[PDB]
Short mmCIF file of all heavy atoms in Angstrom, two decimals:
data_model
loop_
_atom_site.label_atom_id
_atom_site.label_comp_id
_atom_site.label_asym_id
_atom_site.label_seq_id
_atom_site.Cartn_x
_atom_site.Cartn_y
_atom_site.Cartn_z
N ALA C 41 53.77 93.33 152.66
CA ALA C 41 52.35 93.40 153.03
C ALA C 41 51.47 92.84 151.90
O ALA C 41 50.53 92.19 152.08
CB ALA C 41 51.94 94.98 153.30
N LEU C 42 51.80 93.20 150.70
CA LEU C 42 51.08 92.73 149.44
C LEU C 42 51.28 91.22 149.21
O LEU C 42 50.43 90.54 148.67
CB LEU C 42 51.41 93.56 148.27
CG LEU C 42 50.81 94.97 148.33
CD1 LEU C 42 51.41 95.79 147.15
CD2 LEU C 42 49.29 95.16 148.34
N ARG C 43 52.50 90.70 149.58
CA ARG C 43 52.85 89.39 149.31
C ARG C 43 51.97 88.43 150.18
O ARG C 43 51.61 87.35 149.60
CB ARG C 43 54.28 89.08 149.63
CG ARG C 43 54.78 87.64 149.44
CD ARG C 43 56.27 87.48 149.86
NE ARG C 43 57.10 88.58 149.42
CZ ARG C 43 58.23 88.84 150.02
NH1 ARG C 43 58.74 88.17 150.94
NH2 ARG C 43 59.02 89.89 149.47
N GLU C 44 51.54 88.82 151.37
CA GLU C 44 50.85 87.91 152.28
C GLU C 44 49.37 88.24 152.26
O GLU C 44 48.63 87.36 152.80
CB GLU C 44 51.49 88.26 153.80
CG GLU C 44 51.07 89.47 154.34
CD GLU C 44 51.84 89.85 155.64
OE1 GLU C 44 52.63 89.00 156.03
OE2 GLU C 44 51.59 90.88 156.20
N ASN C 45 48.86 89.28 151.68
CA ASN C 45 47.48 89.67 151.79
C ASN C 45 46.91 90.13 150.43
O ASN C 45 47.42 91.24 149.92
CB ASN C 45 47.47 90.75 152.91
CG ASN C 45 46.12 91.19 153.22
OD1 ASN C 45 45.18 91.19 152.30
ND2 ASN C 45 45.95 91.69 154.50
N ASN C 46 45.88 89.51 149.98
CA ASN C 46 45.24 89.71 148.73
C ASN C 46 44.01 90.62 148.92
O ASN C 46 43.22 90.63 148.00
CB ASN C 46 44.92 88.40 147.91
CG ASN C 46 46.00 87.51 147.94
OD1 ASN C 46 45.88 86.21 148.26
ND2 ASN C 46 47.22 87.95 147.45
N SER C 47 43.86 91.17 150.11
CA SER C 47 42.63 92.01 150.25
C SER C 47 42.74 93.25 149.36
O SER C 47 43.75 93.80 149.19
CB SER C 47 42.71 92.48 151.81
OG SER C 47 41.66 93.49 152.13
N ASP C 48 41.65 93.67 148.71
CA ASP C 48 41.62 94.76 147.86
C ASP C 48 41.74 96.06 148.65
O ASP C 48 42.28 97.11 148.17
CB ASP C 48 40.38 94.85 146.98
CG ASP C 48 40.37 93.86 145.90
OD1 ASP C 48 41.56 93.37 145.51
OD2 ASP C 48 39.43 93.38 145.25
N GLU C 49 41.07 96.01 149.85
CA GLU C 49 41.13 97.19 150.72
C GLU C 49 42.65 97.45 150.95
O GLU C 49 43.14 98.52 151.05
CB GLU C 49 40.41 97.07 152.02
CG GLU C 49 39.98 98.38 152.62
CD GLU C 49 38.97 99.05 151.78
OE1 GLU C 49 38.45 98.53 150.70
OE2 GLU C 49 38.68 100.24 152.11
N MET C 50 43.38 96.29 151.25
CA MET C 50 44.85 96.47 151.49
C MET C 50 45.59 97.04 150.44
O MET C 50 46.45 98.05 150.54
CB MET C 50 45.40 95.11 151.91
CG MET C 50 46.93 95.05 152.19
SD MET C 50 47.14 95.98 153.67
CE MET C 50 47.08 94.58 154.83
N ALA C 51 45.25 96.60 149.15
CA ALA C 51 45.83 97.08 147.92
C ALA C 51 45.50 98.66 147.89
O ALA C 51 46.45 99.35 147.39
CB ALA C 51 45.34 96.32 146.80
N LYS C 52 44.37 99.05 148.16
CA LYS C 52 44.07 100.39 148.15
C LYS C 52 44.90 101.35 148.94
O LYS C 52 45.45 102.27 148.56
CB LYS C 52 42.53 100.65 148.50
CG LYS C 52 41.51 100.22 147.53
CD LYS C 52 40.14 100.09 148.18
CE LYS C 52 39.62 101.33 148.79
NZ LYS C 52 38.40 101.06 149.57
N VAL C 53 45.02 100.93 150.27
CA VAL C 53 45.89 101.73 151.13
C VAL C 53 47.32 101.72 150.64
O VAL C 53 47.93 102.79 150.73
CB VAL C 53 45.82 101.09 152.59
CG1 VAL C 53 46.75 101.75 153.60
CG2 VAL C 53 44.43 101.12 153.06
N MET C 54 47.83 100.54 150.14
CA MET C 54 49.22 100.47 149.73
C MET C 54 49.47 101.32 148.56
O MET C 54 50.53 101.99 148.61
CB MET C 54 49.58 99.08 149.40
CG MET C 54 49.65 97.99 150.54
SD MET C 54 50.50 98.47 152.03
CE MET C 54 49.25 99.16 153.14
N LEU C 55 48.57 101.45 147.58
CA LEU C 55 48.79 102.28 146.45
C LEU C 55 48.79 103.83 146.86
O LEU C 55 49.65 104.53 146.46
CB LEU C 55 47.63 102.12 145.46
CG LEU C 55 47.71 102.89 144.09
CD1 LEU C 55 49.03 102.49 143.37
CD2 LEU C 55 46.50 102.65 143.22
N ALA C 56 47.90 104.20 147.74
CA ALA C 56 47.87 105.60 148.28
C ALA C 56 49.24 105.90 148.91
O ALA C 56 49.72 107.01 148.74
CB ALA C 56 46.74 105.87 149.25
N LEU C 57 49.72 104.96 149.76
CA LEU C 57 50.92 105.18 150.44
C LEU C 57 52.21 105.30 149.56
O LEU C 57 53.05 106.23 149.76
CB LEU C 57 51.22 104.10 151.52
CG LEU C 57 50.26 104.02 152.73
CD1 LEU C 57 50.59 102.88 153.59
CD2 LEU C 57 50.34 105.47 153.44
N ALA C 58 52.32 104.41 148.64
CA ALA C 58 53.33 104.44 147.58
C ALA C 58 53.36 105.69 146.90
O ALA C 58 54.35 106.38 146.70
CB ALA C 58 53.16 103.19 146.67
N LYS C 59 52.20 106.22 146.43
CA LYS C 59 52.08 107.51 145.72
C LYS C 59 52.52 108.66 146.70
O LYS C 59 53.22 109.65 146.17
CB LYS C 59 50.75 107.76 145.12
CG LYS C 59 50.32 106.93 144.10
CD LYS C 59 48.87 107.17 143.77
CE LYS C 59 48.28 106.44 142.51
NZ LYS C 59 46.89 106.76 142.43
N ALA C 60 52.18 108.62 147.85
CA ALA C 60 52.49 109.70 148.83
C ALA C 60 53.96 109.76 149.09
O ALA C 60 54.45 110.85 149.09
CB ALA C 60 51.82 109.43 150.13
N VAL C 61 54.57 108.65 149.17
CA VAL C 61 56.12 108.70 149.31
C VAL C 61 56.76 109.24 148.14
O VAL C 61 57.65 110.15 148.21
CB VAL C 61 56.67 107.28 149.60
CG1 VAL C 61 58.12 107.19 149.76
CG2 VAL C 61 56.09 106.80 150.96
N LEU C 62 56.31 108.86 146.89
CA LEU C 62 56.88 109.32 145.71
C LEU C 62 56.68 110.76 145.56
O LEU C 62 57.68 111.50 145.06
CB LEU C 62 56.23 108.52 144.54
CG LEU C 62 56.80 108.69 143.19
CD1 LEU C 62 58.15 107.86 143.17
CD2 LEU C 62 55.94 108.02 142.13
N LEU C 63 55.48 111.27 145.74
CA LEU C 63 55.29 112.71 145.64
C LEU C 63 56.06 113.56 146.65
O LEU C 63 56.51 114.66 146.34
CB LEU C 63 53.83 113.03 145.80
CG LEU C 63 52.93 112.69 144.69
CD1 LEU C 63 51.45 112.97 145.01
CD2 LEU C 63 53.23 113.42 143.32
N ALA C 64 56.16 113.07 147.87
CA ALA C 64 56.97 113.71 148.90
C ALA C 64 58.39 113.73 148.50
O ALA C 64 59.07 114.84 148.77
CB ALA C 64 56.69 113.13 150.20
N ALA C 65 58.91 112.64 147.93
CA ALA C 65 60.25 112.67 147.54
C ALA C 65 60.59 113.86 146.49
O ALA C 65 61.60 114.43 146.45
CB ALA C 65 60.71 111.28 147.10
N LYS C 66 59.51 113.95 145.69
CA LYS C 66 59.70 114.89 144.66
C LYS C 66 59.38 116.35 145.01
O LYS C 66 60.04 117.30 144.52
CB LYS C 66 58.67 114.57 143.39
CG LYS C 66 58.67 115.45 142.34
CD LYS C 66 57.91 114.81 141.14
CE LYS C 66 57.07 115.70 140.34
NZ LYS C 66 55.90 116.34 141.06
N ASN C 67 58.34 116.62 145.89
CA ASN C 67 57.85 117.89 146.21
C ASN C 67 58.51 118.46 147.51
O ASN C 67 58.67 119.70 147.56
CB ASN C 67 56.32 117.78 146.36
CG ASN C 67 55.70 117.65 145.07
OD1 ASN C 67 56.18 117.75 144.02
ND2 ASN C 67 54.32 117.18 145.15
N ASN C 68 58.74 117.71 148.42
CA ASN C 68 59.12 118.22 149.74
C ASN C 68 60.60 118.27 150.09
O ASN C 68 61.44 117.64 149.43
CB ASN C 68 58.38 117.50 150.80
CG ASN C 68 56.94 117.63 150.69
OD1 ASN C 68 56.27 116.67 150.33
ND2 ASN C 68 56.37 118.88 151.14
#
């Protein structure tokens, strides 16, 4: 998604998702 799209809004969503997966792997 980031390779094809330089939208900052895109980057925002992707960062939140990446952190969510990382925290879930650790917490849940």
Side-chain angles (χ1 to χ4, degrees):
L42 290 170
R43 184 183 312 161
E44 72 190 0
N45 186 327
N46 316 126
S47 171
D48 286 337
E49 205 62 14
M50 183 64 91
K52 288 165 53 188
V53 177
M54 294 308 103
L55 183 61
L57 291 180
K59 290 171 175 176
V61 174
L62 190 70
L63 287 175
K66 179 170 145 285
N67 289 343
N68 297 106

